[PDB]
Write a structure and sequence with these properties.
26% of the residues lie in helices and 26% in strands. The chain starts with 8 loop residues before the first strand and ends with a helix. The strands form three sheets. It has a ten-stranded mixed sheet with strand order 1-2-14-10-16-8-7-4-5-12. It has a four-stranded antiparallel sheet with strand order 9-15-11-13, with helices on one face. It has a two-stranded antiparallel ribbon with strand order 3-6. 37% of the residues are buried. α9 runs antiparallel to α10. α1 links the parallel β1 and β2. It has a single domain, classed as Cupin (Jelly Rolls, Sandwich), CATH 2.60.120. It has ten helices and 16 strands. By secondary structure, the chain is of the alpha+beta class. It binds N-oxalylglycine, magnesium ion (MG), nickel (II) ion and zinc ion. One of its GO terms (biological process) is regulation of gene expression. Its EC number is 1.14.11.66. Belongs to the JHDM3 histone demethylase family. One of its GO terms (cellular component) is pericentric heterochromatin. GO terms for molecular function: chromatin DNA binding; damaged DNA binding; histone demethylase activity; histone H3K9 demethylase activity; histone H3K9me2/H3K9me3 demethylase activity; metal ion binding.
């Protein structure tokens, strides 16, 4: 069995290996990368996503989200308070202001300590989930706006044509902006490219150990757990590495820098935070190995999780028994 300790693997594909996306994901899996839940891919030196980032300031962040925390430093929830629209140039200036800028620090580890110690006492503003792409149309390799669609994968595997589309999302972050513990919708893969700016630190639980995280979360968030049998689908709960270690939950951590891809694998719980102003792009995707995870994915039906149009068909075809209840939660 490859990668039996479930370590995060880092890959350095050549330009020739960077041509065929599906083949390279399958190669990574042949080496056990999926066992960690997360892998890093450093593009060949010849590759670029686009020529420059000098002309992105006029992108609009229609609904910036202020991430307000409740709880204790290592065990907290966050809610998103909607703010007035601002451009990327306005957001960058705000991120660099004295109120919001990254503090002085020695190294990534010192910054991580400061994050966990101090996050709850501040409310950073995240430009998340913005439909669009920063890949040049002429970039042919690993262009997240040109991937094979999940609807086409389900059709290829299972023979059923379904409605829906699959497009990327941009994330503009600042110091302390936070992504809560979650798996992807329908336990899909995700791929994330950090276009520019400061790093993003990730934490991940191996898929084979995901239920350990869920059980801890039910213990630590007992009101939430009574409200919903899949409340991590709400994407609001944070648990620190120190707390995970005290409770014996297997996990790993890694920092992504500008120019690097991360892939999350089916049912790989992940969480993390941004170091300072940055821009990432991400999209969900599927492979043949995903289908069995999609069939078994938990679902939120309490009404909180509210998701895209395209998840309808995945539930309807892969989870017909659950469909009626799940759709009530959507309506
Ligand atoms: O970058 C973020 O805020 C969150 N990203 C992801 O959860 C991902 O790419 O799967
Ligand atoms: Mg612009
Ligand atoms: Ni994710
Ligand atoms: Zn719910």
């Amino acid at each position: 069995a490859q990668n039996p300790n479930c370590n995060i693997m880092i890959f350095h594909p050549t330009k020739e290996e960077f041509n065929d996306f599906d083949k390279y994901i399958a190669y990574m899996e042949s080496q056990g990368a999926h066992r960690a839940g997360l892998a890093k891919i450093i593009p060949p030196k010849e590759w670029k996503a686009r020529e420059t980032y000098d002309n992105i300031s006029e992108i609009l962040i229609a609904t910036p989200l202020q991430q307000v925390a409740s709880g204790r430093a290592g065990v907290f929830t966050q809610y998103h308070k909607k703010k007035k629209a601002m451009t990327v140039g306005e957001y960058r200036h705000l991120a660099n202001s004295k109120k919001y800028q990254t503090p002085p620090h020695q190294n990534f580890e010192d910054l991580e300590r400061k994050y966990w110690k101090n996050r709850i006492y501040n409310s950073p503003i995240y430009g998340a989930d913005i439909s669009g792409s920063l890949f040049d149309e002429n970039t042919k390799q690993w262009n997240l706006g040109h991937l094979g669609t999940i609807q086409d994968l389900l059709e290829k595997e299972c023979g059923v044509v379904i409605e829906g589309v699959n497009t990327p999302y941009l994330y503009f972050g600042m110091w302390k902006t936070t992504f809560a513990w979650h798996t992807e919708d329908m336990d899909l893969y995700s791929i994330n490219y950090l276009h520019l700016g400061e790093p993003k630190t990730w934490y991940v639980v191996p898929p084979e150990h995901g239920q350990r995280l869920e059980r801890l979360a039910r213990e630590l968030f007992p009101g939430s757990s009574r409200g919903c049998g899949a409340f991590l689908r709400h994407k609001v709960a944070l648990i620190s590495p120190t707390v995970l270690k005290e409770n014996g939950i297997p996990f790993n951590r890694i920092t992504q820098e500008a120019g690097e891809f991360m892939v999350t694998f089916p049912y790989g719980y992940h969480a993390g935070f941004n170091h300072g102003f940055n821009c990432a792009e991400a999209i969900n995707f599927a492979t043949p190995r995903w289908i069995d995870y999609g069939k078994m994915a938990s679902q939120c039906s309490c009404g909180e999780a509210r998701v895209t149009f395209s998840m309808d068909a995945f539930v309807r075809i892969l989870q017909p028994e659950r469909y009626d209840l799940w759709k009530r939660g959507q309506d």
